Symmetry: D3
Subunit: 20 residues, 6 copies
């Protein structure tokens, strides 16, 4: 976090911070 | 959560986890 | 659309209007 | 648009360009 | 938070809960 | 686009495709 900067990196919107 | 999966279901973007 | 309500009613954030 | 800036003004995430 | 609601009346998408 | 994939690359949620 914050939104656009997912924990662990990678694509924002794809994975645990999003659906996952 | 995460983004696009509201904890109480229904409409994502709609309810506690969004505005609410 | 709008944001959160894809046309045809799929999950918001999952598919071409998002990543896809 | 873009995301955060609804085209007709007002509050991002609240109104026709979001749910509405 | 939640998504779209900084919590103090500010602009969603601008500050710590977004980039920051 | 879609949401999460800004044109030109770059961070999603920052610059013209978001606020900007």
């Amino acid at each position: 976090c914050x939104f656009x900067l997912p924990g662990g990196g990678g694509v924002c919107x794809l994975x645990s911070e999003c659906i996952x």
